Enzyme design. Structure first.
Site, PDB file in Angstrom:
ATOM      1  CB  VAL A  11      35.754  47.122  48.477  1.00 20.52           C
ATOM      2  CG1 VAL A  11      34.467  46.648  47.781  1.00 20.52           C
ATOM      3  CG2 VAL A  11      36.738  45.965  48.624  1.00 20.52           C
ATOM      4  N   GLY A  29      41.073  47.585  52.552  1.00 17.71           N
ATOM      5  CA  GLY A  29      41.823  47.290  51.345  1.00 17.71           C
ATOM      6  C   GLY A  29      43.006  48.213  51.124  1.00 17.71           C
ATOM      7  CB  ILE A  62      53.537  28.465  12.328  1.00 19.00           C
ATOM      8  CG1 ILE A  62      54.070  29.246  13.537  1.00 19.00           C
ATOM      9  CG2 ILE A  62      54.473  27.305  11.969  1.00 19.00           C
ATOM     10  CD1 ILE A  62      54.097  28.490  14.843  1.00 19.00           C
ATOM     11  CB  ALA A  76      50.608  29.436  16.899  1.00 23.40           C
TER      12      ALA A  76
HETATM   13  C1  GRA Z   1      37.238  20.223  14.282  1.00 20.03           C
HETATM   14  C2  GRA Z   1      36.316  19.768  13.153  1.00 20.03           C
HETATM   15  C3  GRA Z   1      37.098  18.892  12.182  1.00 20.03           C
HETATM   16  C4  GRA Z   1      35.255  18.915  13.834  1.00 20.03           C
HETATM   17  O1  GRA Z   1      34.139  18.713  12.971  1.00 20.03           O
HETATM   18  P1  GRA Z   1      33.086  17.518  13.224  1.00 20.03           P
HETATM   19  O2  GRA Z   1      33.833  16.217  13.061  1.00 20.03           O
HETATM   20  O3  GRA Z   1      31.872  17.802  12.366  1.00 20.03           O
HETATM   21  O4  GRA Z   1      32.729  17.688  14.796  1.00 20.03           O
HETATM   22  P2  GRA Z   1      31.326  18.216  15.417  1.00 20.03           P
HETATM   23  O5  GRA Z   1      31.165  17.573  16.777  1.00 20.03           O
HETATM   24  O6  GRA Z   1      30.230  18.067  14.386  1.00 20.03           O
HETATM   25  O7  GRA Z   1      31.582  19.791  15.657  1.00 20.03           O
HETATM   26  C5  GRA Z   1      31.696  20.690  14.560  1.00 20.03           C
HETATM   27  C6  GRA Z   1      30.733  21.846  14.765  1.00 20.03           C
HETATM   28  O8  GRA Z   1      30.980  22.471  16.032  1.00 20.03           O
HETATM   29  C7  GRA Z   1      31.196  23.882  15.873  1.00 20.03           C
HETATM   30  N1  GRA Z   1      32.649  24.228  15.971  1.00 20.03           N
HETATM   31  C8  GRA Z   1      33.674  23.376  15.793  1.00 20.03           C
HETATM   32  N2  GRA Z   1      34.843  24.029  15.944  1.00 20.03           N
HETATM   33  C9  GRA Z   1      34.552  25.313  16.218  1.00 20.03           C
HETATM   34  C10 GRA Z   1      35.339  26.429  16.466  1.00 20.03           C
HETATM   35  N3  GRA Z   1      36.686  26.310  16.454  1.00 20.03           N
HETATM   36  N4  GRA Z   1      34.748  27.621  16.715  1.00 20.03           N
HETATM   37  C11 GRA Z   1      33.410  27.731  16.727  1.00 20.03           C
HETATM   38  N5  GRA Z   1      32.624  26.662  16.492  1.00 20.03           N
HETATM   39  C12 GRA Z   1      33.170  25.440  16.234  1.00 20.03           C
HETATM   40  C13 GRA Z   1      30.695  24.210  14.472  1.00 20.03           C
HETATM   41  O9  GRA Z   1      29.292  24.501  14.525  1.00 20.03           O
HETATM   42  C14 GRA Z   1      30.953  22.922  13.709  1.00 20.03           C
HETATM   43  O10 GRA Z   1      30.175  22.741  12.518  1.00 20.03           O
HETATM   44  P3  GRA Z   1      30.882  22.480  11.079  1.00 20.03           P
HETATM   45  O11 GRA Z   1      31.987  21.473  11.319  1.00 20.03           O
HETATM   46  O12 GRA Z   1      31.395  23.835  10.655  1.00 20.03           O
HETATM   47  O13 GRA Z   1      29.768  21.951  10.206  1.00 20.03           O
HETATM   48  C15 GRA Z   1      35.712  20.960  12.385  1.00 20.03           C
HETATM   49  O14 GRA Z   1      34.495  21.398  13.007  1.00 20.03           O
HETATM   50  C16 GRA Z   1      36.679  22.116  12.261  1.00 20.03           C
HETATM   51  O15 GRA Z   1      37.541  22.074  11.399  1.00 20.03           O
HETATM   52  N6  GRA Z   1      36.507  23.126  13.129  1.00 20.03           N
HETATM   53  C17 GRA Z   1      37.178  24.402  13.413  1.00 20.03           C
HETATM   54  C18 GRA Z   1      37.959  24.934  12.214  1.00 20.03           C
HETATM   55  C19 GRA Z   1      39.398  25.226  12.597  1.00 20.03           C
HETATM   56  O16 GRA Z   1      40.296  24.841  11.859  1.00 20.03           O
HETATM   57  N7  GRA Z   1      39.613  25.901  13.735  1.00 20.03           N
HETATM   58  C20 GRA Z   1      40.874  26.318  14.337  1.00 20.03           C
HETATM   59  C21 GRA Z   1      40.492  27.525  15.187  1.00 20.03           C
HETATM   60  S1  GRA Z   1      41.745  28.773  15.141  1.00 20.03           S
HETATM   61  C22 GRA Z   1      42.784  28.573  16.440  1.00 20.03           C
HETATM   62  O17 GRA Z   1      42.487  27.848  17.385  1.00 20.03           O
HETATM   63  C23 GRA Z   1      44.083  29.278  16.414  1.00 20.03           C
HETATM   64  C24 GRA Z   1      44.879  29.388  17.475  1.00 20.03           C
HETATM   65  C25 GRA Z   1      46.184  30.118  17.309  1.00 20.03           C
HETATM   66  C26 GRA Z   1      46.881  29.552  16.090  1.00 20.03           C
HETATM   67  O18 GRA Z   1      47.579  28.522  16.207  1.00 20.03           O
HETATM   68  O19 GRA Z   1      46.733  30.127  14.993  1.00 20.03           O
HETATM   69  C1  GRA Z   2      37.839  57.570  52.244  1.00 17.56           C
HETATM   70  C2  GRA Z   2      36.946  58.710  52.728  1.00 17.56           C
HETATM   71  C3  GRA Z   2      37.374  59.130  54.129  1.00 17.56           C
HETATM   72  C4  GRA Z   2      37.224  59.859  51.768  1.00 17.56           C
HETATM   73  O1  GRA Z   2      36.217  60.862  51.876  1.00 17.56           O
HETATM   74  P1  GRA Z   2      36.463  62.362  51.337  1.00 17.56           P
HETATM   75  O2  GRA Z   2      37.576  62.960  52.161  1.00 17.56           O
HETATM   76  O3  GRA Z   2      35.114  63.045  51.284  1.00 17.56           O
HETATM   77  O4  GRA Z   2      37.037  62.110  49.842  1.00 17.56           O
HETATM   78  P2  GRA Z   2      36.263  62.404  48.447  1.00 17.56           P
HETATM   79  O5  GRA Z   2      37.314  62.710  47.404  1.00 17.56           O
HETATM   80  O6  GRA Z   2      35.141  63.389  48.690  1.00 17.56           O
HETATM   81  O7  GRA Z   2      35.607  60.979  48.065  1.00 17.56           O
HETATM   82  C5  GRA Z   2      34.524  60.446  48.817  1.00 17.56           C
HETATM   83  C6  GRA Z   2      33.396  60.079  47.869  1.00 17.56           C
HETATM   84  O8  GRA Z   2      33.877  59.180  46.861  1.00 17.56           O
HETATM   85  C7  GRA Z   2      33.072  57.991  46.811  1.00 17.56           C
HETATM   86  N1  GRA Z   2      33.758  56.837  47.473  1.00 17.56           N
HETATM   87  C8  GRA Z   2      34.757  56.926  48.370  1.00 17.56           C
HETATM   88  N2  GRA Z   2      35.126  55.692  48.766  1.00 17.56           N
HETATM   89  C9  GRA Z   2      34.348  54.812  48.112  1.00 17.56           C
HETATM   90  C10 GRA Z   2      34.277  53.426  48.118  1.00 17.56           C
HETATM   91  N3  GRA Z   2      35.117  52.719  48.908  1.00 17.56           N
HETATM   92  N4  GRA Z   2      33.366  52.800  47.336  1.00 17.56           N
HETATM   93  C11 GRA Z   2      32.537  53.509  46.553  1.00 17.56           C
HETATM   94  N5  GRA Z   2      32.588  54.854  46.527  1.00 17.56           N
HETATM   95  C12 GRA Z   2      33.485  55.532  47.298  1.00 17.56           C
HETATM   96  C13 GRA Z   2      31.803  58.331  47.582  1.00 17.56           C
HETATM   97  O9  GRA Z   2      30.852  58.929  46.692  1.00 17.56           O
HETATM   98  C14 GRA Z   2      32.291  59.338  48.610  1.00 17.56           C
HETATM   99  O10 GRA Z   2      31.283  60.193  49.167  1.00 17.56           O
HETATM  100  P3  GRA Z   2      31.039  60.279  50.771  1.00 17.56           P
HETATM  101  O11 GRA Z   2      32.409  60.352  51.410  1.00 17.56           O
HETATM  102  O12 GRA Z   2      30.291  59.013  51.110  1.00 17.56           O
HETATM  103  O13 GRA Z   2      30.223  61.537  50.957  1.00 17.56           O
HETATM  104  C15 GRA Z   2      35.459  58.307  52.753  1.00 17.56           C
HETATM  105  O14 GRA Z   2      34.845  58.561  51.479  1.00 17.56           O
HETATM  106  C16 GRA Z   2      35.259  56.862  53.149  1.00 17.56           C
HETATM  107  O15 GRA Z   2      35.297  56.564  54.331  1.00 17.56           O
HETATM  108  N6  GRA Z   2      35.045  55.997  52.143  1.00 17.56           N
HETATM  109  C17 GRA Z   2      34.832  54.549  52.023  1.00 17.56           C
HETATM  110  C18 GRA Z   2      34.293  53.925  53.308  1.00 17.56           C
HETATM  111  C19 GRA Z   2      35.163  52.763  53.746  1.00 17.56           C
HETATM  112  O16 GRA Z   2      35.496  52.682  54.921  1.00 17.56           O
HETATM  113  N7  GRA Z   2      35.524  51.870  52.812  1.00 17.56           N
HETATM  114  C20 GRA Z   2      36.339  50.669  52.948  1.00 17.56           C
HETATM  115  C21 GRA Z   2      35.877  49.781  51.798  1.00 17.56           C
HETATM  116  S1  GRA Z   2      35.831  48.077  52.273  1.00 17.56           S
HETATM  117  C22 GRA Z   2      37.276  47.339  51.857  1.00 17.56           C
HETATM  118  O17 GRA Z   2      38.066  47.878  51.087  1.00 17.56           O
HETATM  119  C23 GRA Z   2      37.591  46.025  52.456  1.00 17.56           C
HETATM  120  C24 GRA Z   2      38.578  45.242  52.029  1.00 17.56           C
HETATM  121  C25 GRA Z   2      38.804  43.935  52.739  1.00 17.56           C
HETATM  122  C26 GRA Z   2      38.859  44.216  54.226  1.00 17.56           C
HETATM  123  O18 GRA Z   2      39.939  44.575  54.741  1.00 17.56           O
HETATM  124  O19 GRA Z   2      37.816  44.091  54.901  1.00 17.56           O
END
Ligand code: GRA
Ligand code: GRA
Ligand code: GRA
Lengths: 566, 566, 558
Positions: free
Chosen positions: A151, A194, A407, A447
Site C-alpha cells: 500500500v 500486501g 445499429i 451499442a
Molecule cells: C428521455 C426524454 C424523452 C425524457 O424527456 P422528458 O419527458 O422531458 O423528461 P424530464 O423528466 O423532463 O427529463 C428531461 C431532462 O432531463 C435531462 N436529461 C434527460 N436525458 C438525459 C441524458 N440522456 N443525458 C443528460 N441529460 C438528460 C435533460 O435536461 C432533459 O431536458 P430536455 O428533455 O432536453 O428538455 C428526453 O429527455 C430525451 O430524449 N433524452 C435523452 C436523449 C436521448 O435520446 N438519449 C440517449 C442517450 S445515448 C445512449 O444511451 C447510448 C447508449 C449506447 C447506444 O445504444 O448507442
Molecule cells: C520496502 C522497503 C524495505 C524498500 O526500501 P529500499 O530498499 O530503500 O527501496 P527504495 O527503492 O529506496 O524505495 C523506498 C522508498 O520508496 C517509497 N516507498 C516505499 N514503499 C512505499 C509504500 N509502501 N508507500 C509509499 N511509499 C513507499 C518511500 O519514499 C521509500 O523511502 P524510505 O524507505 O522510507 O526511505 C521500505 O521502503 C519499506 O519498508 N517500505 C514500506 C513500509 C511497509 O512496511 N509497507 C507495507 C504497506 S501496508 C500494506 O501493504 C498492507 C496491506 C494489507 C495488510 O496485509 O495489512
C-alpha cells in the site's frame, strides 16, 4: 498431414496489391504511433530510481526481467499507458502483457521497482484483475515478477479497500489455482503485507536470496524525537527484515527454490514453465503456418485517418490472416458485416468485421434505401448470431474487428427486431464460453461496440486492442450536442457556447491515447503489430483449451459450404 | 417436525441481560445513524423533478414503485449513499437492495426518474454490477423498475465505454438467464439506446402504456437557427417516440404485457414473481423461527464507539441469532475467534467473529505472551480454515462479523505459518462456492479484512454492511504516518507537518459515511437493523439454493460434537 | 399475454381429417397394446402376498401408494415390464414412472412389497439408475415409496456387488442432492442394510409408525433354540421409531398409517421449487385439432408401408400447429418447432416414402424415406445446435432404417455428419425424449436422439408398431452367411430369431425401449416430459432472444 484440406486448405484468397500509396495518411497514423511509443518510453523510465541505479545495486528493472524471461520478439504489452486515476508517473506500477517462454505463451505481470519499490498505486488493482481475467479465460499460466512494497500510504483509501482493490488478486489467484491454472512467482526485494500476499497466493514460489515476504514489515517535538531514538536503536539492533530466506526457505519451506541473483530467479521460473501442460499447436492446425500474401505496411494507406472515408475491409483481413485466405460464411446475406473462417499460424479462428461504404438497395425492410457500412441491420445481426453459435459449437475462437457507428434506428428498424436481435447477439456471445479478441480498427461507438464482441463481455473478451486510427465515443460530438441541447433551443447564446464545448470535449476524450489511458481499449498497437497480437492470442487460446471439437465433427465448414451450393 | 433436535435444538444459550446502559455511547452511535438517514433522505429527494411533480404527471418515484412492490417492512436498501465519482445529487441514479414480494425475496433495481430521467451517471455501472452479482451468487431473481434515459451526454466518457461500463449489465443479464436466474423488468417512460438494452435484456418485459424502448430515440448562428427549424417542423410532424406500445406490443411482441398505470405495471411484476421457483423455507428449517432472547437495542451500549475498548462478542451474537442459541465449533482452540453454528428464522448459518480483549498465555508459539483480541494467530486461522471447509461441504452459508486489527507480525509469527495460513483461508473461502455475508462491527483493517470473508471474494461475498461504529483503513493513521516517515527522520519540520496531515486524513477517509460513499462497505445499517439484514440474506440464500446437504448427512454438527466429547 | 405471437401463435397447421379408416390395422395395434396391458397387470399382481392380504395387515401395495399420491390420470409408468435377467415374477420389484402431485411433476419409485418384501432382485439396480438419471437430467424431485428388505440372498452375486449394483443408488442420491435435486422418502415396513441406505440417502425422511431403517436387521437344532429364545426375548427390530425419531432424529416425521405417510410426502413436495408453467408459455394450452385415435389407422403395422409423418405430428402437438425449420432442404427429415401445453419443443422426425430426385450427390436417384442423407444430417445438426442455444428441449420421433451407404455416401461425408450429430446432441446439455414410432435400427437409432446419449435422453418410449434390430433378419442372415445345407438352416434360424427378439414386448423387457405406450397415450407422455422439463430448468433463453424462430423465418423469406 492435416484434416480436410478440401475445406481448410486453398480457401478463396482475398485482397489486392496496393495500387496508390498515401504518404499523408501513413504519416498521420505513424504520428499517433510515435506519440504512444514515446509516452510508453517516458512512463517506463519515470520514477525515483533509474534502471542504471537499480543495476548498480544488483537488481534488474521490470523490462530487464521480462526480456530475460521471454523468447526475443514475442512481447505483447497490454495496459502500457493505463492510468485511470492519473498518477504523476503515468502508470499503475506494473508492466503486463503476453510473452512466450521457450514456445509456451504465458501471461506476465512485473512490479515496477523504479517507482516507490513497486507500491500499490491508484488504478493498479483494476489493472491486476485484467491480468488474471485474461489468464482465466484462456487457461493460460500467470507469471509474477514480483517486487512489491504494498500500500502507498498517502493513497491507502484508493488502493486498500473495496470489492476490486488490493486484496482481490489474492482471491483471483486461488480461483486460478482451483480452475487448474498455475501461478508462478519470482520474489524479489522486500514484499511486506500486501506484497506478502502477492508472494504467497501463487502456486510456485521462487525467491531471490536477499528477498523477503511477510505479514508485516520491519519491525509534538518531544513526540517527534522519541521515534528517531527507537529507529536508530532498532537499526543498531540489526534485526533482519521479517520473512527473509532463513525463515521462508529454512523454516516454513514456502520458498520452493532460492537463487543468487535476478537471472537465477528467471531460470527457476523458466524451469517451472517448462513443467506446465501445453499442446504442440500442430495438433490443432489445419494447415502449415503461412504468412499473409500482402504486406501489413499497406495498412498505413488502406485504413483512412479521415473518419469520413470508407475503405475495403477485405484488404485488412487479407493482410492479417495466413496466406490471405478467407472462407466467408453467408456472403451476400447481411452485407453490412463480414463473417467467416480464417487461419492464424495454421489454426482456425472465426473473424467478424464491419463492411464500409454504401450498401445498395438495403436494408430489405425499407422501401427504397441505401445502407451505411459500419451500421448493423437485421440480416447482419442474424448472421452474426448464427456464426457465433456455430463457432462456439466448433470450439473456434472469435476475433472481432470493430469499425462501427451503431445499429439502425427508427420504427422500421424497431419492427425489424433490431433491439432484440442486438441483445440476441449478446446472449449468443455469453453462451459461447470461449476466449475472444476484440480489435478496434477505427470507430468503436453506440451499442454496436457492445454487441460486436465488446470488452463488456467479461467472461469472453480477454482484452481489447486498437490501432492509431481508432476512436471511442457514445456518438459523434456533433450529434451528441444536438440531442442534448436541441430542446433547450425550443425554449431559448450561453447554450451555443456549451455545444461547442461538448464537440471539443468529445474530440479530446476520444483520442487513442486518452482511450487507452482510461482503459477503454487495453493497448494501442502499430499497424504492423496487429497480426503479432492475433498470433499471440490465437496460440494462447489453443495452448491448453478446456474443450475440443474434432475437425471432422465441425459444423461451421459444412453449413458454410451448403449455403454456397444449395 | 424437524431433523435431529439433539443437534439443532436446545443449543447452548449465550449473552447476559444488560446490567449497565451507556447513554453517551448510544447517543454517539445514533448520531452517525441519524446523519446516514438524513443524507439518504436528502439524496432521495435531490434532482430536477420532485416526487410531487412526478405524481402530477401520472408517474411514481423510485421509492413509490418499490414500496408498492414489496411486503411492508422488508426493504433492505444497499448502496444508498454509493457515489464514488462524487455526482452533485449524491447518488448513482438507481435505488437498489433486497425486498420481499408475497414471501419471496428478490433483488430490486429502480431507476431514479427524479434525476435527468434516470440517466447513466458516473459510478452507476459499478453499482449495477453489484446488483447482478448479488442475484448471481444467491440465485435470486433480479427485478428492474426501469425508467432510463441512457448516457448522460456531458459524462459519456465515464458512463459509456470500458469493461465495467454501461454495456456490461446487458451481458450480466444474459449470464443470469443462462445460469437459470430470471430477470423481470417494468418499463416506464422513455428508454432509448442504453435504456433500450436495459429494457430488452431481461427475461420478462412488462410495459406502461405510454412507455417506449428503442435502439435510438427521437427521431454559427446560421448553423444555430437551422436546428430549431427542423425541431419545430418535427414537433408539428408529430412522429411518435420510437418503440412505443403500438410497436413493441402490437408488432414485435417484445412487450409481453401492457398496463394502464404504474401500479398496474407493479401488479404484472408481482404476477410473474409469483410464477418463480422458490422453496417453502420450512423445508430447510431445523427449528421453528424464534426471536433472540435479548433485545437488539442493548447493542447501543455493548458495542463501544471508543475504539480502544474491548467488548464481549457473544453479547452481539446472542442478540442477532434465533433464541440466543449458539453451537460453537472448537471452543478453547484458537481463542481469538468465535466459529460456530447458529439459526436465522430456523435456518442454519455458520458464524465467524472476532473475540476482543486480552488473551492470556497466547499465542502458543510465543514463550510468554498476552494475545490481542481482534488479531489473527495460528489456531484461529486453522480453525476458520476447517470451519469454512466443513460449512461448505454442508451447504451452510457463512456470515462474517469483522472487528479486526490484522494478523500477528514478526518472525515468530512467520515461522508459525501465518502468511500461508491466511492465504489458505482465502483458498478455503474461494473453494466454498456459497453466498456469504460480511458485517463490519467496528474495525475492518489490514489483511484480516480480506481473509475474514471480505468483499474481495467476488465469487462468494454477496455484499457487505457495517454498523455506525465501523471504520476502514489499511492501518491506524498513527502507525501509518510512522512507517511512512520514520526513515525520513533518519535523514532529517516539513516532515512533522505532513505526518499530522496523514493522521487527519486517515480519520476523515475512514468514517462510516465516507466508507459507504466509496463502496468500501455497501450500506451503513442501524444496530436494530443488522438482524433484519441477516434474515433477508439467509432467507434469500435458502430460497432456491443450487446444492443441498441433507441434515443427517452434515459433518459440521458431528465434528463439533466429537471435539466436545473426545 | 405472451411474447411474440407473430412467431409463436397461428403457426401453419398440418394434418388432414382421416378419410379411410383401417379396422384391420387398428385391431393389430390394439392386440399388441392389450398383450402389454395384460402382461403388466399379471406382473403387478404376481408375488407371494396379494394386495388383499397386504390390506388386511394394514398395508398398501405399490400402486395403492402411488394412486394415493398422484393427481388422478397423471400416472406415466416406465419400465413396467423391464426384466432383463428374467425373474419369474416378471419385474425388478419396483414400480417407477412420472406422476404429478398437486400440479408438480415428480419422479416416483415404489418398492413392490408383494414380492419378497421389496427385496433387491436381478435387474433392479439398473432400473433404479434409470430413475435417478431421469431426475438428474430434468432437475426433477425423486420420490421413494420405500418398502425394501434388501439383498435377495440366493441372488446376492447379481444384486450386491459391482459399479452398477445395489450400492450405486446411494451415491446417485448424494449426487442428486449435490446438484440441488431433492429426494423424499416414505419409509414403510422393514428396511435393513440395503433398504436402510435407501432410507437414509434421501433429503427428507417420512416414517410409518411401525417402520424401521437399520445398518443390519434382527448343528441344525441349535439355531431354532437361539431363534425361539430371541423371539421370547422380544427385542425390537433395530432402528424402529423409538430409535430413529426419538434418539437420532433421522426420521423427520412419523405418521400412523400409509396414507399419513403420503400426506407427509405431499406436504414436502408442496415445499419444492417449481415454476408456474405459464412463465414459459408462448400460447395458452390447446388440444390438437385432429383426434389421436386416427393413429390406429395412420401408422401401418405393415412394415413395408409408408405413411405421412405430418399426420402423426398434427395429432401430438398443440392445435396441430408446426413451424418447420428449413422445409425443402433435407427432405428425409422433418425438423421444427411445436407447442406442448403452450410450451416450445423442437421436434425431429423421419419422413417416409419415395424421395424424388434425391440425394443431390447421386445421379438420377430416388431416395428412401426413413434413411439419412447429407442434407438431413446437416439440417439436424443445425436445428439441435439452435434449440440448444434457445434452451428448447428436443423430442425425437424415430422410424428409421439407417444412414445411406456406399462410396458416394462416404464422399458426401455421411459417416462424419452422423457423428457430428452425436457431438451436437452431447453439446446441447438439455433433457430430451425419444419416441420410437416404428423402426429403430442401424446407426440412425443412435444419432436420432437415441437412448445411447446417457446425458441427454431421459428415457425412451415406443408404440405398438415399433421394432428394434441392428438390421432386418434377412439382410443380417445374408451378410453373415453369404461368404460361407447346414448353412441354409441356420439362416432361417437367424431370420426367425430377429423377428422374435425385436417384438415390442421383448424390447421393453430388455429395456431397449423403456415403455410401450398406447397410441392415445403418446401425447400424455410428451406432456409429462415437457412439463417436467420446464418445471425447474437450470438455464433460460428469453423468447425475444431466441435464434431458432428468427433463422427459421429468414430461410423462408431470403
Ligand atoms: C428521455 C426524454 C424523452 C425524457 O424527456 P422528458 O419527458 O422531458 O423528461 P424530464 O423528466 O423532463 O427529463 C428531461 C431532462 O432531463 C435531462 N436529461 C434527460 N436525458 C438525459 C441524458 N440522456 N443525458 C443528460 N441529460 C438528460 C435533460 O435536461 C432533459 O431536458 P430536455 O428533455 O432536453 O428538455 C428526453 O429527455 C430525451 O430524449 N433524452 C435523452 C436523449 C436521448 O435520446 N438519449 C440517449 C442517450 S445515448 C445512449 O444511451 C447510448 C447508449 C449506447 C447506444 O445504444 O448507442
Ligand atoms: C520496502 C522497503 C524495505 C524498500 O526500501 P529500499 O530498499 O530503500 O527501496 P527504495 O527503492 O529506496 O524505495 C523506498 C522508498 O520508496 C517509497 N516507498 C516505499 N514503499 C512505499 C509504500 N509502501 N508507500 C509509499 N511509499 C513507499 C518511500 O519514499 C521509500 O523511502 P524510505 O524507505 O522510507 O526511505 C521500505 O521502503 C519499506 O519498508 N517500505 C514500506 C513500509 C511497509 O512496511 N509497507 C507495507 C504497506 S501496508 C500494506 O501493504 C498492507 C496491506 C494489507 C495488510 O496485509 O495489512
Ligand atoms: C423383512 C421382513 C421383516 C419382512 O417381514 P414379513 O412380515 O415376514 O414379510 P413377508 O411378506 O412375509 O415376506 C417374507 C418372505 O419373503 C422372502 N424374503 C424376505 N426378505 C428376503 C430377502 N432379503 N431375500 C430373499 N427373500 C426374502 C422370504 O421368503 C420371507 O420368508 P421368511 O420371512 O424367511 O419366512 C422379514 O422377511 C425379514 O426380516 N427378512 C430378512 C431381511 C434381511 O435379512 N435383509 C438383509 C438383506 S442383506 C442386504 O441387503 C445387505 C446389503 C449390503 C449391506 O448394507 O450390508
Amino acid at each position: 498431414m492435416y484434416s480436410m484440406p478440401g475445406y481448410f486448405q486453398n480457401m478463396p484468397t482475398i485482397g489486392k496489391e496496393l495500387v496508390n500509396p498515401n504518404p499523408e495518411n501513413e504519416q498521420e497514423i505513424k504520428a499517433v504511433e510515435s506519440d504512444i511509443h514515446e509516452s510508453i518510453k517516458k512512463a517506463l523510465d519515470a520514477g525515483i530510481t533509474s534502471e542504471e541505479k537499480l543495476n548498480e545495486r544488483g537488481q534488474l528493472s521490470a523490462m530487464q526481467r521480462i526480456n530475460a524471461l521471454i523468447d526475443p520478439g514475442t512481447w505483447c504489452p497490454l495496459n502500457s499507458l493505463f492510468n485511470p486515476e492519473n498518477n504523476k508517473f503515468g502508470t499503475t506500477n506494473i508492466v503486463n502483457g503476453l510473452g512466450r517462454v521457450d514456445g509456451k505463451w504465458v501471461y506476465i505481470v512485473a512490479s515496477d521497482n523504479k517507482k516507490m519499490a513497486g507500491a500499490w498505486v491508484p488504478g493498479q488493482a483494476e489493472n491486476l484483475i485484467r491480468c488474471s481475467d485474461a489468464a482465466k479465460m484462456m487457461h493460460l499460466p500467470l507469471i509474477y515478477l514480483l517486487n512489491c512494497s504494498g500500500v502507498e500510504f498517502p493513497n491507502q483509501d484508493k488502493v486498500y479497500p473495496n470489492r476490486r482493490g488490493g486484496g482481490t488478486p489474492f482471491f483471483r489467484n486461488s480461483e486460478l489455482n482451483q480452475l487448474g491454472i498455475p501461478v508462478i512467482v519470482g520474489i524479489y526485494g522486500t514484499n511486506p503485507a500486501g506484497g506478502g500476499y502477492h508472494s504467497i497466493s501463487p502456486t510456485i514460489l521462487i525467491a531471490h536470496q536477499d528477498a523477503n515476504m511477510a505479514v508485516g514489515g520491519a519491525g509534538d517535538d518531544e513526540a517527534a524525537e522519541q521515534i528517531i531514538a527507537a529507529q536508530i536503536e532498532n537499526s543498531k539492533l540489526k534485526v533482519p527484515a521479517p520473512g527473509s530466506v532463513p525463515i521462508h526457505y529454512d523454516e516454513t519451506g514456502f520458498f520452493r527454490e532460492v537463487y543468487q541473483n535476478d537471472l537465477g530467479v528467471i531460470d527457476g521460473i523458466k524451469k517451472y514453465i517448462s513443467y506446465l501442460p501445453a499442446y504442440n499447436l500442430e495438433f490443432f492446425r489445419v494447415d502449415t503456418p503461412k504468412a499473409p500474401q500482402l504486406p501489413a505496411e499497406d495498412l498505413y494507406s488502406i485504413i483512412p485517418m479521415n473518419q469520413k472515408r470508407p475503405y475495403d475491409i477485405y484488404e485488412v483481413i487479407a493482410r492479417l490472416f495466413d496466406n490471405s485466405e478467407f472462407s466467408e460464411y453467408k456472403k451476400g446475406y447481411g452485407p453490412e458485416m463480414v463473417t467467416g473462417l480464417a487461419k492464424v499460424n495454421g489454426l482456425l479462428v472465426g473473424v467478424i468485421a464491419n463492411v464500409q461504404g454504401l450498401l445498395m438497395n438495403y436494408p430489405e425492410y425499407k422501401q427504397n434505401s441505401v445502407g451505411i457500412g459500419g451500421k448493423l441491420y437485421r440480416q447482419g445481426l442474424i448472421k452474426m448470431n448464427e456464426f457465433v453459435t456455430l463457432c462456439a459449437r466448433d470450439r473456434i475462437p472469435l476475433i472481432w474487428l470493430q469499425d462501427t457507428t451503431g445499429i439502425d434506428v427508427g420504427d422500421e428498424a424497431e419492427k425489424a427486431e433490431l433491439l432484440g436481435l442486438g441483445q440476441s447477439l449478446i446472449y449468443s456471445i455469453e453462451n459461447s464460453k470461449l476466449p475472444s479478441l476484440e480489435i478496434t480498427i477505427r470507430k468503436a461507438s453506440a451499442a454496436a461496440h457492445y454487441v460486436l464482441g465488446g470488452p463488456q463481455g467479461n467472461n469472453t473478451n480477454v482484452f481489447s486492442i486498437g490501432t492509431g486510427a481508432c476512436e471511442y465515443y457514445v456518438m459523434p460530438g456533433e450529434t451528441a450536442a444536438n440531442a442534448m441541447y436541441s430542446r433547450k433551443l425550443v425554449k431559448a447564446q450561453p447554450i451555443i457556447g456549451k455545444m461547442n464545448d461538448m464537440i471539443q470535449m468529445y474530440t479530446d476524450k476520444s483520442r487513442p491515447k486518452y482511450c487507452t489511458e482510461k482503459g477503454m481499449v487495453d493497448e494501442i498497437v502499430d499497424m504492423t503489430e496487429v497480426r503479432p497480437y492475433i498470433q499471440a492470442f490465437t496460440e494462447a487460446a489453443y495452448q491448453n483449451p478446456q474443450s475440443i471439437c474434432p475437425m471432422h465433427q465441425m459444423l461451421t465448414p459444412r453449413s458454410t459450404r451448403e449455403f454456397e451450393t444449395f
